[PDB]
Amino acid sequence: SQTLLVHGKDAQGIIKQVLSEVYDAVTSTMGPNGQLVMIKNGVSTKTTKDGVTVARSIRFADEAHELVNRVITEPATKTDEECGDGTTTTIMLTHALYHLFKDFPGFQHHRNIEDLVERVIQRLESMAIRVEVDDPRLYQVALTSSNQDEKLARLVSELYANNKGSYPDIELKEGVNFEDQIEQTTGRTIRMFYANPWFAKGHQGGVTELTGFTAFVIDRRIDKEDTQKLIDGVNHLVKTHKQHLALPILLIARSFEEAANSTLMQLNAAHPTLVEDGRPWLIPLSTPGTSELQDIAVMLNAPMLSDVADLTKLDTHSINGQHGQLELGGNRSILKSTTPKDEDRIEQHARGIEELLEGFSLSDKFSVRARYNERRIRTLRGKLITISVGGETYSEVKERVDRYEDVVKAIRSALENGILPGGGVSLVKAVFGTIKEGLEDKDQSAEFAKRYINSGIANELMRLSTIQHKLLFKDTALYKENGSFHFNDDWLNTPTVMNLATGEIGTPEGLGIYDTAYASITALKGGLQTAKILATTKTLILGEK
Amino acid sequence: SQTLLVHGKDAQGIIKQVLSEVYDAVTSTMGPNGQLVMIKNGVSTKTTKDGVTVARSIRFADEAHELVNRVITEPATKTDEECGDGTTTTIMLTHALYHLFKDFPGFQHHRNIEDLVERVIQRLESMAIRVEVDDPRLYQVALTSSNQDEKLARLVSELYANNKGSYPDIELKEGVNFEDQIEQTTGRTIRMFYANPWFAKGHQGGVTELTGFTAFVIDRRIDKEDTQKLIDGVNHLVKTHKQHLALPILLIARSFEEAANSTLMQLNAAHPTLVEDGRPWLIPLSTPGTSELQDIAVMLNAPMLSDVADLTKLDTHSINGQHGQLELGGNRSILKSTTPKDEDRIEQHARGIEELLEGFSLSDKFSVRARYNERRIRTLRGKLITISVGGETYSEVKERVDRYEDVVKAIRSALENGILPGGGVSLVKAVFGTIKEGLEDKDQSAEFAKRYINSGIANELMRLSTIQHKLLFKDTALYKENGSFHFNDDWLNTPTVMNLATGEIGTPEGLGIYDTAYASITALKGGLQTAKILATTKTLILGEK
Amino acid sequence: SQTLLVHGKDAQGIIKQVLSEVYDAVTSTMGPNGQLVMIKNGVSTKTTKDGVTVARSIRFADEAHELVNRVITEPATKTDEECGDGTTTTIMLTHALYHLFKDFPGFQHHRNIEDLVERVIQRLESMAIRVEVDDPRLYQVALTSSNQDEKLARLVSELYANNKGSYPDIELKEGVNFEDQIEQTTGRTIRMFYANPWFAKGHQGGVTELTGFTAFVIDRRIDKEDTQKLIDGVNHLVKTHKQHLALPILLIARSFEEAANSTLMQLNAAHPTLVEDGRPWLIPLSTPGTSELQDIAVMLNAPMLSDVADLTKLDTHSINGQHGQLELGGNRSILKSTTPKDEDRIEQHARGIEELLEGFSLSDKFSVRARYNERRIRTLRGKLITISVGGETYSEVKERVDRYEDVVKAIRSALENGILPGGGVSLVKAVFGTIKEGLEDKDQSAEFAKRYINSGIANELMRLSTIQHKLLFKDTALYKENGSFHFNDDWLNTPTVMNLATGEIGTPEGLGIYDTAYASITALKGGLQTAKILATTKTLILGEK
Ligand SMILES: Nc1ncnc2c1ncn2[C@@H]1O[C@H](COP(=O)(O)OP(=O)(O)OP(=O)(O)O)[C@@H](O)[C@H]1O
Ligand SMILES: Nc1ncnc2c1ncn2[C@@H]1O[C@H](COP(=O)(O)OP(=O)(O)OP(=O)(O)O)[C@@H](O)[C@H]1O
Ligand SMILES: Nc1ncnc2c1ncn2[C@@H]1O[C@H](COP(=O)(O)OP(=O)(O)OP(=O)(O)O)[C@@H](O)[C@H]1O
Ligand SMILES: [Mg+2]
Ligand SMILES: [Mg+2]
Ligand SMILES: [Mg+2]
C-alpha cells in the first residue's frame, strides 16, 4: 500500500511483467516434451506438467501484479472447465497477440487487428474436420489429449465406437483395484431429484426404484403462494381420473420450497389406501434454460405446464401414465427401461434439436447457445456408463481419474464441433491462408492490402502463427537443419511436424496428432480478447473501499 | 499523522496533485475508444470502462489526499445517481475550470468567471432540443448512452414509443434466460408500505390484494403520544359511519412507531365481526416533500388530514370508500384497477402540477424543486413494466442490468428536460455564442469587453470548451490533417466530429450522436462549483477530535 | 516471500544446491564405516548412522529449498517402508543420474539415457539370485542388513530355516529382560477385527476366543442403506437353517457404519435363547484390493457374496459352519486350530496365487501388483511368532527393535524377489554388461553405437556405476595401491571388495556381503525417475492460494 492508483507507463510495465512471467512458466510445460513445475501446498509437493494446474496456482506477491494475473489466468482456466485440454495454447496467443497490439498503436490499427484475427478464426471454424465415432482419428485425438496413453485412448474411443448410434454419458469413481473396471447400463442420466428426503422409500433420501409412474412437468418455482392450487390439482387427479393412472405421481418442477413440501407430505397421508409397502404415491422433484424441462417432459410422456392451476384442467388426452422403469435419487434420477414406442417419441424430438443446429451459422455453431442444445441431445440420446478407475497407489488412482476426464471432455467436443491437425500447424495454415484469400481476391485486394499488408500487420501476424510450432520443435531434430525453418509453399501443402513420443517426422495427419476444434478456436478467440484488454488498459486501482 | 493542519502552498499543491491524478484516470475512460481500468476488490478483478465505477472506486493513501478526492468524486458520482450517463464530463470541467480560476487570481476576477460561465449555462439551457417519445432521436440518445447497444437502445425507445401518452415506470430483475423478457402491467407504483408485518393476509408481511378499501391520509408521525386519538377516531368511524364504508380502512401516514402499531392490533381484535378471511380491516401504512402524501390522497380519493384528532369530525362528504383494486406490499403498494371516474380526478391533479412547470423560470426548470415535481407526475400518470434482463453468464446479466439502468435514466431525463448535439460540440457553440452575444450587443459591449475580453478570460474559456472535442478526437483521422484543428466560423455553423464506433466523419446531428441536456448542463454547473471550491481552499484539517 | 515464481537458471541452481547438500549428508552414513549425523528433537539428541533416519529428518530454511528436498527425500523414505535397508543407495544414484542428464542435454539424449538405464535395470532383474530358506546366504544378507549383528542375524535366519515350509509372520514387542525371548504359535494373523466393542465377550472390546463358528464374507460397505436386508438375511438364517449351524455367526465385511452396528445389536437381543454365557451370537467384522476378503473367505470356508440381499437365497451347499478355533480381537483376529481337511483347501488356493506369479513378466515380478499378491500368500500360509526384544536400557531395547524390523523386512524381500552380490559390484557388472551386450550383438551394433557409445553416454554411465564402490572403499586398503582402481576384465570375472567389519579382501560372494535384489533394483528405478524429475524441472511455485 505505497500507491493505490497506478496510471500509464507504470501500469503497462506491470502488465507486461506479469504476462511475460506467466508466459515463461506455463508454456514450458507444453507438449509431451514440456518441462516440469513444482508447486507448494502446505507440507507436500504437487510436481506437474499439466498447464491448467500451473496456470491456476501461480500467485504473485504484489496486489497490483496479482490483479493482472487474474485477468490472464481466469480465461485459460475457463477453457478447460468447458472444453478439455487447451489452456496453455490460450495463454501463448494472449502473449503473442498482446505483443502485436503494442507493435501497432493508434486505435484504427487496433480495430484492423481485431478484424483480421476474427477472419482467421472463421478459417479455423471452416477447417474443422467433422468426424464420426467409427473413425480411427478419435483414438488419435484421445492419444494426443492423454499425453500418449496407449491404454486409455484405446478404451474411450473403443467405448464410443462400440456404441455406434447413441452418445455415451461417462462418469468416474475412485477404484479399489490395479485394473480398471466398467459398468455399462442402458440408462439415461436425467437432471431431476428429490425435493425433500421424506419422499424416498424408507423416508430418508434413499434410491427409490419404480416400475410405473405418471409424470407432470411444471415450469414455475413453488413456494408459500402455490399451496392452495396443489391441493386443488392433486385431489382432482386422484378423485376424477383414477382409472387411467399408474402410481406414483411425479411432480417435476424448477424448485420446491419448504412450505410446499410440507403440504405435499400431508396429501400422501390423506389417501393411505394407495400407499403400497411404505412408498409415498406423490413426489415433488427439483432441477437447478427452460428447455431442459421440456426434454424431461418428452422423456416421460408428461405434459408441459406453465401454471400450477393447470393441473385441474386435464383429461385422458393429456394424462398418460407410463409403465416403464425409473430410479429416483438424491443427486439425480435415472431412466432405464424405455419401450420402443417411447424411444420413437424421443428420437423425433432429438432430430428437431439437430435440425436447429444444421441451419445455424458457422460462428454460431461454436457459441454457448449451440453447445447448450448439444447438451440436451446427449441427455436424451445417451447411455450411462460408470468406470471405476484403478492404479497402484491412491494418488495414481486420483491422478488417472483426471486424465480420464480430460479425454472424455475432448472426444465429446471433438465429434461435436470438429478436429484439426495438431502441432501448431492448423494455426499457420489458417493465418497464411486468410492473408492469401483477400489478397488474391481482386474485388477487395485494393483495401485489404491498404489495412493489413501495406501497414505490415499481415506479416507480423504470420510470424506469430509460427510461435506454437517453434515452441514445440525448436531444439529438436526438425529444426537442426537449415538454421531456423523455411515456411514456404512446399510446407503449406504437406506440413511436416515431429511426433515427440516416437521421434519420427511427417505430417500431423500421418503421425496421428490432432487437436480438438473447440480448443484451438476458443484459445484464439479468448487469446484476442485478453490480449486486447491487457494492451488497452492504462490504469490499476488497488483500493478496497 | 506528521502534520494535521495544512495551509497555503502545501494545501493547493495537494489539491492540484489529487485533481490532476483523478482527471487522468477517469478521462482515459471517455467515449467508446476510451482505455480501461482494472479494479481490485479482495480476490477478484472488475475491469471496466464506466467512468462512474472508476470515479467511485479511486482511493488515496494519504488522508489529506483522500480528503480532496472525496470533494472531487462525490459531485460526479452524484450526477449519475439522479441523471444517468454524465459523470466523466463533470470531472473534466472540474479540472478545466480549476485551471481557469488559478490562471486568473484576485476575487474580482473570480466573481467575473462565475458570471460568464453562468451565462454559458443559460446558453446551454436554451439550446435544449425538446423531444417527443415519437422522435427517432430518442434511439440516438439511448444508442449513445449505451456505448452502441443495437439491441438495447432499440428496445427501450420502442417501449417508450409504444406507450405514447403515459410515461413508463421501469424496474429491473436478474433474469434466468439468454433472452430478455418483458412484463407489462397497467399499474402505478405507490410509495406506501406496511408499518408492521402483522397487518398483511396470513399475519406475516405478505402481499395483500384487495378489491375495495377506504383510505385516510395523515400528515404527522405517529408514536406513543397519539394512542388516545386513534381509539377516538377508529371507534367513531365504525360505530357512526359504517353504512358508507368498504373494508379495509387504510391509515396512511409518515411514520408508525412500535407503540401505535400495538394499539391498532388490539382495535382489529376489538371488532371480530368485520374480519373477512383473516385480512385485518385496519392497516397503518408508512412512507420514507409532504406533497407525495397529497398524491397518495388524490389517487385513493382520501381526504388530506393534518392532525390525528380530525378523524372524529368527518361526514359522508369527506369520507369516500373506493371499490377499485389495490395490492399492499412490504417494499411498496401498487394500484391496478382504476375506474374512469378516478382517472378524471388524477389527470386533473397531474395537469395542475404541469401548470407550475410551464411557468417556471429557465434556470428553475433544471433545479431539484423541478425534478421532484416531475417525479410526482410519473408516480401519478405512469404504467409499470418489469424487465428481467438476461445474458450468457451471471456477471453479464448484472453488467447488462446496469447498462439498462443507465439508458433508462438517460431517456427519461432526455425527453424530460432536453437533448443536445454531442461529441463535445454543444459546449464550444455555447461559449463561442455567449462571447459573441455580449460582444455584438451594442448596449453592454462597453463593459462586457472590460470584464471578459479585455482581461483575457473569454479567450481562456474559448480554449477550454475545446477540451472534450480534443480528448475524444485527438490521435484520430479528424485531427491528423492540418496540425491541430481550426475552430472557425465554417466549423461553428456545421460542426464536424467522428463517430468512434463506425469511423466516418460528419455532424453530431447527421451521425446521430446526442448527449442528454440535463447531463451536460449539470456537468458544467457541478464543474464550476467544485472548481471554485478547490481553487478557493487554503486550509486542510485532518484531526479526528 | 521476496519472489514466489522462480524460473530457469534460478530454479535449476536451487535443485542442484539441495541435491548436493542432501547427497553429502546421507551418503556419509553409508556402510559400517559411515560417519555420524546428530539430529535435534526439542530437548534431546538422537545421534545416528541409519540413512533413512538422516534423510527423513533433513530440513531446509527457505520454502523453495524444502520444496525440492521433499522431492529428493520422499522416494528413498518410501523404499524402506516397503523394502527394508535401501535408502542411501536411492539418493546416491538420484545424484549420479541427475549429473548424467545435465552432461547430455537436448531431449533426444534424455530419451536415450532412459532407455539405456532401463536395459541396465533388466540385467539386474535377471541377475537376481533366487534363494530357499535352507540357504546359508540368508544369514549373509541379514548380517549385511544389520551392520554386522552376529546375535540377531543368526536368530532370524534360524527362525526362517527351522520353519522350512511355512513362511513365518513376525511381530515385535519391547521386552523386559537383557536376553531375547520368542513365542511360537501355530496361528495365522487375519485382517478382520471388531466393528463395535459391544460384540466381544464382556461387551467392551475384549479378546473373544471361540471353538466353533459360521462365517459369511460380504463385499459392500454397510451403512444406513442396508438395515432392511440384514434383518431379512439374519432371521432367514436362524429360522430356516438352524440345524446345520455352529454359533457364533460372523458377518465379515468391508465396513460397518454406526447405523448398521446398532441394528445387529438388536438382532442378538431378538433371539436370547442362543446367548451362551453372555457371548453375542452375531458379530460384524471390518477390514481397512478386494482379493484379501477372498482369502478370509477361503480360510474360514465362508461363501463370497457381492450384495447384502444374497444372504436370503442360501443353502447347505453354500453354508458350512466350521468347528475349528478362532480368536476375535480389536486390532486383528487370529486362527489357530485348522483341520488337515481345511489346510488342503488353503494350500490349493495358495498354489493358485503362486501359479499367477510363475507366469508374470520379469519386470512385473518386481511390481506392487506382484508384492501385494505375495502379501496374500504369507497371510494364508504363515505361522505367527512374537519376539520380545531386550537390551541394557529402554533406549537400546527400542533401538534394537528397529534393527530387528529392518532384518525381517530384508529377509522377507530377499527370498521373495532375489539376492545380488553387494559392495557396489552388481551395479558395475550390470552396466558394463549391458554396454557389451548390445555392442557385441551384430544385429543392432550399428545404432547402439550411434546412440550411446559414440555420443559418450556409455562411458559416463559406466563411470557412474563405480560411485558406490568408490564411496565404500576409496580411502581404504583396496584403493591405496595403483593410484585409483582398474576395473578391467580380470576384475569383472572375480570382483574384489573389502569387508569393512573385518578388514580382509575378497569377493562379495566369498566374504558374504549380499544386498537384497528388491533394494538395489528399486534404488536404481527410483534414482532414474527422481533424477529425470529434478533435471527436467524449470519452474518453482511457492504460492499458498
Ligand atoms: N506427440 C506430439 N507431437 C507433437 N505435438 C504434440 C504431441 N502431442 C501434443 N502435441 C501438441 O501440443 C499442444 C498441446 O499441448 P498441451 O496439451 O501440453 O497443452 P494444452 O492442450 O494447450 O492445455 P492443457 O494443459 O489443458 O492440456 C497441441 O498444439 C498439440 O498439437
Ligand atoms: N459514437 C460516438 N462518437 C463520438 N462521441 C461519442 C460517441 N459515443 C459517446 N460519445 C461522447 O462521449 C461522451 C460521453 O462519455 P461517457 O459516456 O464515456 O462518460 P459520461 O457520460 O461523462 O459518464 P458515464 O461514465 O456515467 O457514462 C459524450 O461527450 C459523447 O458525445
Ligand atoms: N561388511 C561390508 N563390507 C562392504 N560393504 C558392505 C558391508 N556391509 C554393507 N556393505 C555395503 O554397504 C551398502 C549399504 O549401505 P547402507 O545400509 O548404509 O545403505 P542403505 O541400505 O541404502 O541405507 P539404509 O540401510 O538406511 O536403508 C551396500 O552396498 C552394501 O554392499
Ligand atoms: Mg492435459
Ligand atoms: Mg454509462
Ligand atoms: Mg539398516
Residue numbers in the entry:
A (entry chain C), B (entry chain D), C (entry chain B): 2 to 289, 295 to 551
What text does the study give?
Our structural and functional analysis of the chaperonin ɸEL from the bacteriophage EL of P. aeruginosa revealed that the protein is ATPase active and functions in aggregation prevention of denatured proteins. ɸEL forms tetradecameric double ring complexes, which dissociate into a population of single rings in the presence of ATP and at physiological salt concentration. As anticipated, the ɸEL subunits displayed the typical three-domain architecture of chaperonins, composed of an equatorial domain (residues 2–130 and 425–552), an intermediate domain (residues 131–188 and 388–424), and an apical domain (residues 189–387). The domain structures of ɸEL differ from those of GroEL by numerous insertions and deletions, which alter the putative substrate-binding cleft and the contacts at the ring-ring interface. Our functional data rather suggests that the chaperone mechanism of ɸEL is encapsulation independent, and represents an evolutionary precursor of the more complex encapsulation mechanisms used by the group I and II chaperonins.
